[PDB]
Ligand binder design. Structure first.
Ligand SMILES: [Mg+2]
Ligand SMILES: [Mg+2]
Ligand SMILES: [Mg+2]
Lengths: 290, 128, 95, 51, 54
RNA sequence: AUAGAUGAGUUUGGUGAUGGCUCUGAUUGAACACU
């Protein structure tokens, strides 16, 4: 039963960015506006616009009520500590001066002096912001059906959900048929090779195959759902990327959920096609759903 | 107030606010059945103008209230069993209730297309 | 580059000292909008008092306020005042 | 006999000015106040000593 | 190749005054400096006195 | 349990206050209408 919300799934007029590799979706992603118009809109009109844009991609197949409580105000992050710094300094120099360290001359004086002041001691890679706003939809990255789509085992989040519901996935060597299963750090999910080749392979064309009847490497086998010899789907390279909280092994179509997505200074691990301005309004919406 | 004045019980519950539909709020009921004692017309107050179709209903609890009849045209009259819900007619004084259109004797608006669930109108089924 | 088609940013270009292209990169927003009225010998005179903010998003914010009989003119007055009244705001870790 | 005078700027003649401003305003989506400001901005007045 | 720049359709300026509704793409130009006053003309009232001298 | 604290409409010729009302959030051993 097709609901009213899925009619214009890849509308070229509305241009919604969906979690799939469809060619109509590639055009909507490439030609997306550099910045949505939020000049004269009110605070509600901005949060609703950001909520509609983001929810068109993140957890598209999950009800609004289920995600409303799946949303978490806890945005995890990490910091990089260089052993070379911690071995030479105990952090006292960071509390010099009046508690915040010594003062450096303003920028309009440094370059004036031909001699640059000695490098200030500090852990390398500091004074760079962390994109917390970009982690609004991190909880969705823990579902089994989503992790399968992020491992490049399926062409869409809905096709990966069918692999689970149809007993084609195996977590920790045990059959798992719940797409809402929340992976734990260390879980190893494995999909059937036959479903991955069809999901990511090219469509089976009879007209072109009809000409190839008789006229390492592989051969032809018309007794398989995908076109032989197996070749990658068209436009699959535009969506080819594996996040760092997964360790995929394509030889067996298996991956390990190493950890949860975290935000690092200057980087986020949640695949989202939206800017911090939109992810900041979506986060503000789900604080009180208004 | 001082700690002594509070210890003696200066803090008391604020005076109650009257409900929109006291006949229903008093007993926690969402709706009540009643018989129409009179079906007539009420006149709005200063700003608005027109004739509001109202009904004097005798609730099953014994109270006699005045309910507003939503929609265009009705079927009830004297000695008619109808279901009453909360909500008031803002411009009508004393009309603090509404009648349900898909009620026992009150029928839904026949030539209704939009918001049929508000007026107890079955779907035309013209397609089937 | 023909960006200023009404010469409204000409005086602001002297006070602040940044090109019109850099002025258009600021984050402006009309926050408050009141419809005030003054009783005069000639009847009521309703004005549009507005408040506008301007900032870089990196530690600068300015508040402007102006009124006028036209709602459009008041928004431009407040915008020019907001861009010239910008001040550095101290931030802890820029957050 | 015709004596046609070519004007370098449309602001040097009132007839040509009200004609242009009228054609601009004839459109439904024309911003009245904005169009008047663009015309006045095109008008250059010479420097003067008020005293 | 020499006639290419002649048939190239020019996009009107974002904030344009003359080509805001012009649908004849042949007349659309850059519009830069087309309204600058080069101090080479007087008012219509002056031409009446100049023609009187002629 | 260290993230958890938020507003909006509405009195006046207008402005700032005072002070209610309503909406925004969550829910029910619910009922009714359309399904
Ligand atoms: Mg009232
Ligand atoms: Mg309709
Ligand atoms: Mg008074």
């Amino acid at each position: 039963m097709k609901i009213r919300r899925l009619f214009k799934y890849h509308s070229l007029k509305k241009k919604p960015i969906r979690p799939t590799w469809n060619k109509y979706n590639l055009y909507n992603l490439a030609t997306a506006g550099r910045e949505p118009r939020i000049s004269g809109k009110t605070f509600f009109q901005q949060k609703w616009l950001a909520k509609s844009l983001t929810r068109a991609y993140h957890g598209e197949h999950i009800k609004e009520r289920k995600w409303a409580r799946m949303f978490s105000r806890r945005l995890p992050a990490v910091v990089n500590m260089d052993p070379a710094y911690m071995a030479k300094y105990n952090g006292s120099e960071q509390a010099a001066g009046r508690g915040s360290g010594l003062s450096e001359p303003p920028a309009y004086e440094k370059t004036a002096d031909e001699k640059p002041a000695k490098q200030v001691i500090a852990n390398p890679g500091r004074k760079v912001p962390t994109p917390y706003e970009q982690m609004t939809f991190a909880p969705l990255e823990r579902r089994l059906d989503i992790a399968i789509f992020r491992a490049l085992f399926a062409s869409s989040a809905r096709q990966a959900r069918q692999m689970v519901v149809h007993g084609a996935v195996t977590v920790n060597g045990k059959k798992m048929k719940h797409p809402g299963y929340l992976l734990n750090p260390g879980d190893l999910f494995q999909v059937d090779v036959e479903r991955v080749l069809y999901a990511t392979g090219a469509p089976k064309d009879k007209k072109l195959l009809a000409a190839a009847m008789k006229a390492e490497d592989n051969e032809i086998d018309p007794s398989k759902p995908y076109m032989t010899p197996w070749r990658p789907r068209n436009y699959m390279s535009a969506f080819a990327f594996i996040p760092r909280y997964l360790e995929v092994n394509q030889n067996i179509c298996a991956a390990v959920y190493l950890r949860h997505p975290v935000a690092r200074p200057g980087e986020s691990e949640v695949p989202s096609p939206f800017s911090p301005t939109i992810n900041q309004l979506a986060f503000n919406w789900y604080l009180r759903r208004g | 107030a001082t700690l002594n004045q509070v210890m003696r019980g200066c803090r008391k519950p604020q005076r109650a606010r009257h409900a929109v539909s006291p006949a229903l709020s008093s007993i926690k009921s969402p709706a009540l059945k009643g018989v129409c004692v009179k079906v007539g017309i009420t006149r709005p107050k200063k700003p608005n103008s027109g004739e509001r179709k109202t009904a004097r209903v005798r609730l099953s609890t014994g109270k006699v209230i005045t309910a507003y009849i939503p929609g265009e045209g009705h079927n009830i009259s004297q000695h008619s069993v109808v279901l009453v819900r909360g909500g008031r007619a803002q411009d009508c004084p004393g009309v603090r209730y509404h009648l349900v259109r898909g009620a026992l004797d009150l029928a839904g608006v026949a030539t209704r297309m939009s918001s049929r669930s508000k007026y107890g109108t079955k779907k035309p089924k013209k397609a089937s | 580059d023909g960006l200023d088609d009404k010469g409204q940013y000409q005086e602001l270009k002297k006070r602040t000292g940044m090109s019109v292209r850099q002025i258009l990169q600021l984050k402006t927003k009309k926050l408050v909008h009141r419809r005030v009225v003054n009783q005069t010998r000639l009847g009521k005179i309703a004005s549009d008092s507005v408040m506008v903010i301007a900032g870089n998003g990196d530690g600068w914010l300015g508040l402007g306020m102006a009124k006028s009989v036209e709602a459009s003119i008041a928004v431009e007055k407040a915008t020019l005042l907001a861009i010239q009244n910008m001040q550095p705001i101290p931030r802890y870790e820029n957050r | 006999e015709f004596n046609i005078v070519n004007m370098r700027s449309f602001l040097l003649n009132s007839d040509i000015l009200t004609k242009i401003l009228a054609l601009k305003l004839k459109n439904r989506n024309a911003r009245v106040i904005k169009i008047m400001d663009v015309i006045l901005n095109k008008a250059n007045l010479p420097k003067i000593n008020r005293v | 190749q020499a006639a290419a720049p002649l048939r190239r359709v020019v996009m009107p300026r974002r904030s344009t005054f003359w080509y805001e509704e012009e649908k004849d793409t042949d007349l659309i130009t850059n519009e830069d400096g087309e309204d600058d006053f080069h101090e080479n003309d007087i008012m219509s009232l002056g031409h009446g006195k100049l023609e009187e001298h002629r």
